[PDB]
Design an enzyme around this catalytic site. Structure first.
Site: not given
Ligand SMILES: OC[C@H]1O[C@@H](O)[C@H](O)[C@@H](O)[C@@H]1O
Ligand SMILES: *[C@@H]1O[C@H](CO)[C@@H](O[C@@H]2O[C@H](CO)[C@@H](O[C@@H]3O[C@H](CO[C@H]4O[C@H](CO[C@H]5O[C@H](CO)[C@@H](O)[C@H](O)[C@@H]5O)[C@@H](O)[C@H](O[C@H]5O[C@H](CO)[C@@H](O)[C@H](O)[C@@H]5O)[C@@H]4O)[C@@H](O)[C@H](O[C@H]4O[C@H](CO)[C@@H](O)[C@H](O)[C@@H]4O[C@H]4O[C@H](CO)[C@@H](O)[C@H](O)[C@@H]4O)[C@@H]3O)[C@H](O)[C@H]2NC(C)=O)[C@H](O)[C@H]1NC(C)=O
Ligand SMILES: *[C@@H]1O[C@H](CO)[C@@H](O)[C@H](O)[C@H]1NC(C)=O
Length: 711
Positions: A234
């Site tokens: 993540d």
């Molecule tokens: O935008 C990219 C990523 O951002 C993160 O803050 C989130 O937890 C993810 O679900 C997401 O895919």
């Protein structure tokens, strides 16, 4: 991964491509260019020697993010509320098409984590409801749909990210059986449908960051569930250069933190390999897995469209959004046939959620859908997208009511006086309340991702009260990210109908009139429990450093059943404009006791997903109008087995039927569907003895019962 199977074929192409590459090519494949370093949400360096492009990764679970010509699909939770695998698969197909056409390789979705153990959990709506089985099937169906179009899917978030508060520091520490039998279960379904990718979560697991944990990544996901694909972090969920690489991590996304620091791979990974802190076989493996995905989805082939996010790729996909928003609506209450509406003289529509607001406008203040102003169609955070259009409930009600002579009075705020005035005199009064939540980096109305409470937003309770005091026939319509306590609303004898509309996205208004006027009978059922009191739930958003998950297997309705608490509306509950009769329940099994004996293929030991028993019941439309029923199978395990939740959903079918029309619902029992994770022997085991078979319209409305034997 065995040959002749889709993954096996891809690994051959992946190993062959790996030969042409230098270390400089390899670490550029695995290293994100940085936070907003490329034109997409995620980007890696290209490898021109094998015609491998800069990999473009984009949000998310319900459509293409930051796109100006894109469909906003319903959140996953609405799809699951349809209980309709055909609509679920379609939804994934339709998302995939828009992703290919917009020139994106990887869609960051769909969601099995959080599963959704706490109703206040801010991100649950992105998932598929609380039940690992339903969520499992829906993961399978969605992923097939997505990947058959030639795009890479990402199972998300692995694992145990069941709350937004301190998600980046809190530790999730369940016992082994809870981990295998509850939270991982849906992830198995994803791996088994040959999912391209898996995202490791922001949280810790037994004190170890998820994107650095040997046991969850290597031993469990990769080894035990036989996941041939790759694991990405993540955004900034990596904490080490060395430890993460050795653990099982394959991709550092997006490359840096927001300030452009903490670049733990790339140049640092080039250093680490040289010192042999990181071996070469480990870096080869990452690149194998990554490329194998690119080959699995055939993205090497032909002319994969270039990244263009302003392309109008919508098409006629709104049909899927229409059908899911409509068939995902749950009818909770309907007294004295108030509903469907059949040409009344007057209608009062009350509430700010009735009309277009900043949420539906893609307002500059309401970024990432980070607000609950006006009509609601989804939660906030990374899993939100822009609306191409939005059909507000008021507008759709207006058009339809007017067309047939009915007059409409609007009280478009949440003011109680205006609400009551507009209601007084009219034949029915329809009032609109909401509750919102999202990813925990945006605080909306004091809610830091997770909800502070389980009550209606903007004093929805008082508004219903005001209106009920001015009208005898009240219809309450709820659009919500999760359970809302309904006891105050229900205490009002004037409230004659409640409509659990869920999260409808761009087609909100149309879906609703579809149901309100009875062009379609509602057929949605709940994918989580609506309690009489907040106290009746057994999980909390945890404010300290650790969630022990000590409730174990017993979440939502499994707790409610075991402790004999009566909910307001149970899991799998839903009403209809017609009614149904169950008959001729039959059970056939060849299932055998003992551990799973097949070798490990994507999804785990090969026999686990193979059918071992079949259950049958006949559903007859005993009402006066057409309508669909979601017939459900619940299984009670044998007394010889350890403590297991009393009822466990193990199958579901949906049958649409005309008046008097009869049909057969077929429940296929995989081996796992009769198994439990025996911790001692470290294997999936089917227990011996007599299983309970419960078939009915909900987890509580059991209509017929029988047994199933194991030798
Ligand atoms: O935008 C990219 C990523 O951002 C993160 O803050 C989130 O937890 C993810 O679900 C997401 O895919
Ligand atoms: C966070 O941490 C938790 C806590 O550690 C993690 O859960 C743990 O996960 C590991 C797997 O990584 C499990 O390890 C396995 O344990 C079994 C034996 O399990 C029994 O004993 C456990 C320990 O007992 C001690 O304490 C009790 C008092 O409580 C004492 O009486 C004992 O003397 C011990 O000192 C006990 O915890 C277990 O109870 C749990 O499960 C039972 C049901 O089984 C429940 O009733 C309980 O509620 C409770 O939850 C259990 O009784 C070992 O057998 C495993 O080793 C085998 O398998 C390995 C892999 O294949 C292999 O390497 C070994 O060689 C070994 O194989 C041997 O046995 C095979 C089969 O019998 C043979 O075929 C073979 O020949 C060979 O001889 C393994 O070590 C933990 O049990 C588990 N703990 C709990 C509490 O669940 C959790 O995963 C982490 N979560 C994360 C990271 O998210
Ligand atoms: C992006 O799409 C638009 C179509 O609206 C087109 O005019 C433009 O040429 C495209 N740009 C690129 C770089 O593909």
């Amino acid at each position: 991964p065995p040959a002749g199977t889709p993954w096996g074929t891809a690994y051959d192409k992946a190993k062959a491509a790996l030969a042409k590459l230098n270390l400089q090519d390899k670490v550029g494949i695995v290293s994100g260019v940085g936070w907003n370093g490329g034109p997409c949400v995620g980007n890696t360096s290209p490898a021109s020697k094998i015609s491998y492009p800069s990999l473009c990764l984009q949000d998310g679970p319900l459509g293409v993010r930051y796109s100006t010509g894109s469909t906003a699909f319903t959140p996953g939770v609405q799809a699951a509320s349809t209980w309709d695998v055909n609509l679920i698969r379609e939804r994934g197909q339709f998302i995939g098409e828009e992703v290919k056409a917009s020139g994106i390789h990887v869609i960051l979705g769909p969601v099995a984590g959080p599963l959704g153990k706490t109703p206040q959990g801010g991100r649950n709506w992105e998932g598929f409801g609380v039940d690992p089985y339903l969520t499992g099937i829906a993961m399978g169906q969605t992923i097939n749909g997505i990947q058959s179009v030639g795009v890479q899917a990402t199972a998300k978030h692995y694992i145990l990210n069941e709350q937004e508060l301190n998600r980046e520091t809190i530790s999730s520490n369940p016992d082994d059986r809870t981990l295998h039998e509850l939270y991982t279960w849906p992830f198995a379904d994803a791996v088994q449908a040959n999912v391209a990718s898996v995202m490791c979560s922001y949280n810790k697991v037994n004190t170890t960051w998820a994107c650095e944990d040997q046991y969850t990544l290597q031993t469990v996901l990769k080894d035990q569930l036989g996941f041939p694909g790759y694991v990405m972090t993540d955004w900034n969920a990596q904490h080490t250069t060395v430890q993460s690489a050795n653990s099982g991590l394959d991709m550092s996304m997006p490359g840096t933190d927001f300030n452009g620091n903490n670049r733990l791979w790339g140049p640092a990974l080039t250093n680490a390999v040289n010192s042999n802190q990181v071996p070469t076989s480990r870096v080869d493996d990452m690149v194998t897995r990554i490329l194998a995905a690119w080959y699995l989805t055939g993205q090497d082939q032909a002319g994969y469209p270039s990244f263009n996010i302003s392309r109008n790729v919508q098409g006629n996909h709104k049909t899927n959004v229409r059908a899911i928003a409509r068939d995902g609506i749950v009818l909770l209450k309907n007294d004295a046939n108030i509903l469907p509406l059949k040409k009344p003289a007057s209608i009062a529509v009350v509430g700010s959620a009735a009309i277009i607001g900043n949420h539906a406008r893609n307002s500059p203040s309401c970024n990432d859908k980070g607000c609950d102003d006006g009509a609601l169609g989804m939660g906030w955070g990374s899993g939100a997208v822009n609306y191409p259009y939005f059909v507000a409930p008021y507008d759709a009600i207006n058009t339809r009511a007017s067309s047939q002579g009915t007059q409409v009075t609007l009280s478009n705020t949440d003011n109680t006086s205006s609400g009551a005035s507009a209601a007084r005199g009219k034949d029915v009064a329809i009032v609109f309340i909401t509750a919102d939540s999202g990813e925990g980096y945006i605080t909306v109305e004091g809610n830091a991702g997770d909800r502070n409470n389980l009550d209606p937003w903007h004093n929805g309770n008082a508004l219903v009260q005001a209106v009920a005091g001015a009208n005898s026939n009240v219809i309450v319509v709820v659009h919500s990210v999760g359970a809302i306590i309904l006891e105050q609303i229900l205490a009002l004898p004037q409230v004659k109908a409640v409509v659990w509309a869920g999260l409808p996205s761009q087609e909100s208004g149309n879906a609703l009139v579809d149901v309100l006027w009875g062009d379609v009978s509602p057929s949605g059922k709940l994918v989580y429990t609506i309690a009489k009191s907040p106290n009746d739930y057994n999980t909390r958003i945890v404010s300290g450093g650790s969630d022990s998950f000590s409730e174990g297997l017993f979440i939502d309705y499994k707790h409610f059943d075991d402790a004999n608490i009566t909910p307001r509306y149970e899991f799998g509950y839903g009403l209809s404009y017609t009614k149904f009769n169950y008959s001729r329940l039959s059970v056939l099994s060849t299932a055998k006791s003992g551990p799973a004996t097949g070798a490990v293929v994507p999804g785990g030991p090969s026999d686990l997903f193979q059918n071992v028993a079949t259950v049958t019941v006949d559903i007859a439309n005993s009402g006066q109008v057409t309508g669909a029923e979601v017939a459900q199978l619940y299984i009670t395990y044998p007394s010889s087995a350890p403590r297991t939740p009393p009822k466990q959903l193990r199958g579901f079918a949906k049958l649409n039927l005309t008046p008097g029309q009869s049909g057969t619902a077929t429940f296929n029992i995989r081996r796992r569907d009769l198994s439990y994770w025996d911790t001692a022997s470290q294997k999936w085991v089917v227990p011996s003895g007599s299983f309970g078979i419960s078939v009915g319209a909900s987890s509580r409305d059991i209509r017929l019962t029988s047994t199933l034997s194991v030798a």
